[PDB]
Amino acid sequence: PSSLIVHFNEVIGRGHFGCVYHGTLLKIHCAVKSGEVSQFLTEGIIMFSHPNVLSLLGICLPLVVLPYMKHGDLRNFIRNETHNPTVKDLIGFGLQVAKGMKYLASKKFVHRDLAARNCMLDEKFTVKVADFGLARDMYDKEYYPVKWMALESLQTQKFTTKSDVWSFGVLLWELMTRGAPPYPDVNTFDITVYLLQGRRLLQPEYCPDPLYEVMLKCWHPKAEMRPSFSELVSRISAIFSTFI
Numbered sequence: 001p002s003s004l005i006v007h008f009n010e011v012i013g014r015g016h017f018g019c020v021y022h023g024t025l026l027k028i029h030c031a032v033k034s035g036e037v038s039q040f041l042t043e044g045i046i047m048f049s050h051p052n053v054l055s056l057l058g059i060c061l062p063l064v065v066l067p068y069m070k071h072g073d074l075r076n077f078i079r080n081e082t083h084n085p086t087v088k089d090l091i092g093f094g095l096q097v098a099k100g101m102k103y104l105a106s107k108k109f110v111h112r113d114l115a116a117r118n119c120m121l122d123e124k125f126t127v128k129v130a131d132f133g134l135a136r137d138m139y140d141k142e143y144y145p146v147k148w149m150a151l152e153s154l155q156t157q158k159f160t161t162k163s164d165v166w167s168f169g170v171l172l173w174e175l176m177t178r179g180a181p182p183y184p185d186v187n188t189f190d191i192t193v194y195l196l197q198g199r200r201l202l203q204p205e206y207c208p209d210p211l212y213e214v215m216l217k218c219w220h221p222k223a224e225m226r227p228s229f230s231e232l233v234s235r236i237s238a239i240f241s242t243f244i
């Protein structure tokens with residue numbers, strides 16, 4: 001009621017997220033917006049919270065308040081030449097995404113657009129998985145940006161947690177290339193054809209061999225054979241621990 005100062009003359013991220021304003025919650029910096037909303041927000045009201053997931057701070061009377069993220073796009077952050085993240089930091093960012101995804105999958109939620117441009121970074125360098133309206137609760141069922149999509153989703157329009165695992169592999173690839181575009185010489189229509197030819201993304205220059213074998217496991221032709229986000233958190237923790 002009297003615990004929110006809202007700056008209606010100051011929008012976050014130059015309009016790239018719509019009308020979202022700078023706020024101060026009683027002093028915490030925040031993002032303020034005024035049923036079509038993200039399902040993670042409706043879950044945080046009715047049900048749901050994780051440090052690696054961008055979620056609701058609260059509701060004010062309506063005013064939907066989320067926390068402020070200094071770097072609203074992880075893809076932009078790793079692509080900016082003023083930042084020089086190490087191979088250990090980039091693997092660390094991926095481990096955080098896998099932690100948020102392991103949590104969301106336990107909640108039976110399917111993201112459907114897991115990419116580095118849909119992850120945010122704050123001032124303490126903590127990564128959060130954001131949803132812009134595409135994630136769905138799968139409830140009791142086990143199913144519900146073509147270059148990040150799994151082969152069985154391109155062919156059938158059905159999404160499962162294992163199709164998110166495929167996208168996580170492309171996110172890992174984006175991380176090791178510091179924001180390079182996947183399949184740069186391929187058109188989005190012939191992606192299914194390009195893949196069915198027996199192809200996958202090439203191993204980047206600074207991607208350690210054990211991390212590339214993990215990306216290949218994520219892109220396994222059979223969805224049921226892909227590792228879970230628990231196995232990915234386990235496997236990536238070990239690789240990360242080998243670096244000083």
Ligand SMILES: Cc1ccc(-c2ccc3c(C)n[nH]c3c2)c2c1[C@H](N(C)C(=O)c1ncccc1C(F)F)CCC2
Nearest residue numbers: 017031033036037038064066067068069072131132133
């Ligand atoms: C409501 C809201 C408040 C703050 C943000 C935000 C943005 C940037 C930053 C940054 C850079 N830091 N913190 C931030 C917070 C966002 C939302 C978003 N959103 C618009 C909705 O859920 C939504 N609302 C109405 C209609 C449809 C939808 C959606 F489903 F399409 C979800 C993620 C972005």
